[PDB]
């Protein structure tokens, strides 16, 4: 199909960025669309041949280059705060004979005026309450990833080391903490609803992975806190039945049983040794 690289990208104002498209179905000509909330898809450049590049609707500040016939990379020589958009690659075979296109998976950019604004997501996993497990008999874990910037998370639920795609709702658009301001901070939530005879095991393990995409190692940082690189922040929880007879009280019950019965077995064997010694001494002293 059509691939493009990177997925997410952060960069300071006034900084170049080369973002690559690739197409192995051997269609001829590609285009770069950008998308903003409120204006729809807008064309930037399109390259009808191996080298024949033409401008689109908004070519203002976009160097393209067409050298091969499977790659058409876009370049941003200088950056602007009005560059925050979602970019897309296109793919067409031959000049309106087959009018279909095939869009790539999306490429995001946010451009800050200063790199003291990036933060890692603070992730918390809120366990359900017994009101649900009595009333509806279903439990809803809620993950909150608060405080990150920019909107570059990919939240995912892992149950016993494997993901779940069944019972997970996630907000498509994050909020802002201050919606009136410009350099705000985002907050994303998620709900895992689970049948409440699965939460009551102390053996199941639920965790909320958040794949933050941010700075890289090749970028300077002179600020006191840790440098917020591309990372994974997650919080875990065992399942917990609070009141009842789970398989940990039973573990300690059987361990105390093994202690008491090894002790009692030692008692009875020593009393057997004592009475056998008394019987042997009495049989010596009768014969």
């Amino acid at each position: 199909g059509v691939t493009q690289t990177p997925k997410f990208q952060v960069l300071k104002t006034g900084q170049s960025m080369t973002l690559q498209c690739a197409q192995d179905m051997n269609h001829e000509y590609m285009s770069w669309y950008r998308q903003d909330p409120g204006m729809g898809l807008r064309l930037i450049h399109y390259s009808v041949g191996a080298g024949i590049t033409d401008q689109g609707e908004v070519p203002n500040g976009y160097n393209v280059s067409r050298s091969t016939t499977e790659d058409f990379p876009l370049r941003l020589l200088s950056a602007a705060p009005s560059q925050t958009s979602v970019y897309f690659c296109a793919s067409r075979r031959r000049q309106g004979a087959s009018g279909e296109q095939y869009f790539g998976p999306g490429t995001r950019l946010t451009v800050t005026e200063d790199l003291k604004n990036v933060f890692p997501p603070e992730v918390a996993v809120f366990e359900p309450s017994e009101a649900e497990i009595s009333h509806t008999q279903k439990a809803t874990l809620v993950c909150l990833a608060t405080g990150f910037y920019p909107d570059h998370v990919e939240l995912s639920w892992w149950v016993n080391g494997k993901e779940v795609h069944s019972g997970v709702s996630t907000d498509p658009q994050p909020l802002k903490e201050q919606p009136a301001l410009n350099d705000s901070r985002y907050c994303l939530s998620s709900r895992l609803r689970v049948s409440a005879t699965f939460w009551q095991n102390p053996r199941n393990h639920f965790r909320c992975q958040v794949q933050f995409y941010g700075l890289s190692e090749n970028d300077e940082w002179t600020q006191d806190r840790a440098k917020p690189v591309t990372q994974i922040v997650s919080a875990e929880a065992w399942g917990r039945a609070d009141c009842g007879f789970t398989s940990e009280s039973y573990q300690q019950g059987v361990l105390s049983a093994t202690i008491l019965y090894e002790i009692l077995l030692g008692k009875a064997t020593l009393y057997a040794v004592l009475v056998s010694a008394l019987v042997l001494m009495a049989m010596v002293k009768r014969k």
């Binding site: 007879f245 009280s249 019950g253």
Partner: protein
């Protein structure tokens, strides 16, 4: 039937071993 089962098993072990010792004491106080 499944409230806190091992404690019930072992307390029933307890007050039947005590009654076994009391039965042996009855044999020791009746037979001789």
């Amino acid at each position: 039937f499944g409230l806190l089962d091992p404690k019930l098993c072992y307390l029933l072990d307890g007050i039947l071993f005590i009654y076994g010792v009391i039965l042996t004491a009855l044999f020791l106080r009746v037979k001789f």
